[PDB]
Amino acid sequence: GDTKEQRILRYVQQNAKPGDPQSVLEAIDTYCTQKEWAMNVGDAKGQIMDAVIREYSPSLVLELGAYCGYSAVRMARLLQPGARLLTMEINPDCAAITQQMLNFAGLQDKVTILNGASQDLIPQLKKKYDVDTLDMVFLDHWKDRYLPDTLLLEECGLLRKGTVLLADNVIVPGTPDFLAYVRGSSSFECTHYSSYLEYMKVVDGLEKAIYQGPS
Ligand SMILES: Cc1nc(C)c(-c2cc(C(C)(C)c3ccccc3)n[nH]2)s1
Ligand code: NA
Ligand code: NA
């Protein structure tokens, strides 16, 4: 049976160029804006993500909620040799799509895909995936999970001073609990990056929260 996610992957494989991550991004953004709507960060927000990666040049990045691999491709393509992306995806079919997307783009050796729930996998990073601390975390999974997974990252000792959290959809549909906590806590230095959801004709935004150390 055909699914939307399989259709996205097929469109990329037909029209993008293997080993060319930029063509893969353009293909997905074309597909989602012109052929069939899908959950997608999109190019406007993508350029903010690009800027953050280039500013902090993280060596170890954790992504929560890979879906079809658009953001994994977006970030992994800007990573240096020896840098790693760890990405978590709760849905097995989407995890498979993400793998094929990264393989097509030529980035499969920079990325480890973890199939499971954030709250189960996050406490295993130190022991099983040889993580000390994370340089960057991109949050784009279930919205009611942003605040508790941030708290769990902190108590698992995965954040250090200077670790960048970047969270999507904090306005639409909105994560006001997360926002209240990080903006109000002295442990996080926060900035907001507005971006228009053109298809929905409403403004959304990404929050950047830089860990400052425990309170
Ligand atoms: C507690 C959770 N841990 C993770 C890693 C979660 C996750 C969410 C997601 C998307 C693609 C956004 C998703 C998945 C299923 C339904 C709706 C939406 N992928 N991974 S959820
Ligand atoms: Na999103
Ligand atoms: Na703060």
Side-chain angles (χ1 to χ4, degrees), residues 85-119:
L85 172 64
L86 308 175
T87 180
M88 297 180 176
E89 171 46 55
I90 197 171
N91 183 279
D93 296 320
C94 292
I97 297 287
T98 293
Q99 180 69 78
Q100 301 173 66
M101 192 73 71
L102 284 165
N103 187 22
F104 184 87
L107 297 162
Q108 67 295 317
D109 294 329
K110 304 216 68 62
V111 185
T112 302
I113 297 166
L114 301 190
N115 187 217
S118 53
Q119 77 275 359

Side-chain angles (χ1 to χ4, degrees), residues 139 143-151 165-168 170 174-185 188 190 206-209:
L139 299 81
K143 309 312 167 197
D144 70 340
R145 300 319 170 88
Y146 288 23
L147 172 60
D149 289 351
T150 294
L151 292 176
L165 305 197
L166 183 65
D168 191 28
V170 301
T175 63
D177 55 355
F178 173 79
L179 288 188
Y181 173 75
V182 293
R183 294 181 173 170
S185 159
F188 296 92
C190 296
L206 300 108
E207 194 78 4
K208 175 159 76 179

Side-chain angles (χ1 to χ4, degrees), residues 1-181:
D2 200 32
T3 68
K4 174 144 67 180
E5 294 84 24
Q6 289 159 27
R7 287 193 287 274
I8 298 167
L9 178 62
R10 287 195 204 98
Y11 184 88
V12 167
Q13 291 162 334
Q14 171 157 330
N15 303 283
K17 176 174 185 170
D20 188 342
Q22 182 63 37
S23 68
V24 168
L25 296 175
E26 297 183 8
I28 297 171
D29 284 327
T30 293
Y31 187 84
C32 292
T33 55
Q34 282 198 331
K35 293 194 71 179
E36 186 179 20
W37 174 89
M39 293 183 290
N40 193 59
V41 159
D43 190 72
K45 290 179 177 170
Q47 286 176 19
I48 303 166
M49 296 173 50
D50 289 356
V52 176
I53 302 285
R54 292 186 171 122
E55 179 174 7
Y56 300 87
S57 70
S59 296
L60 182 57
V61 179
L62 169 64
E63 167 184 25
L64 308 178
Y67 189 33
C68 292
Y70 180 89
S71 289
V73 167
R74 195 100 208 176
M75 296 184 286
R77 87 191 203 286
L78 302 178
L79 292 185
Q80 305 287 347
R84 290 194 291 162
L85 172 64
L86 308 175
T87 180
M88 297 180 176
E89 171 46 55
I90 197 171
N91 183 279
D93 296 320
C94 292
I97 297 287
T98 293
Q99 180 69 78
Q100 301 173 66
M101 192 73 71
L102 284 165
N103 187 22
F104 184 87
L107 297 162
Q108 67 295 317
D109 294 329
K110 304 216 68 62
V111 185
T112 302
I113 297 166
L114 301 190
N115 187 217
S118 53
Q119 77 275 359
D120 298 329
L121 297 168
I122 285 170
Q124 304 172 42
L125 290 182
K126 269 179 185 301
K127 183 162 186 180
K128 300 195 181 187
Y129 299 87
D130 306 323
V131 167
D132 177 25
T133 61
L134 304 157
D135 300 310
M136 180 170 167
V137 181
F138 181 66
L139 299 81
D140 195 23
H141 59 329
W142 293 341
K143 309 312 167 197
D144 70 340
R145 300 319 170 88
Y146 288 23
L147 172 60
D149 289 351
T150 294
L151 292 176
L152 179 69
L153 286 166
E154 174 175 42
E155 72 196 45
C156 283
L158 293 160
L159 313 181
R160 45 89 175 170
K161 176 176 163 258
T163 296
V164 180
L165 305 197
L166 183 65
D168 191 28
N169 309 126
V170 301
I171 305 304
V172 180
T175 63
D177 55 355
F178 173 79
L179 288 188
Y181 173 75

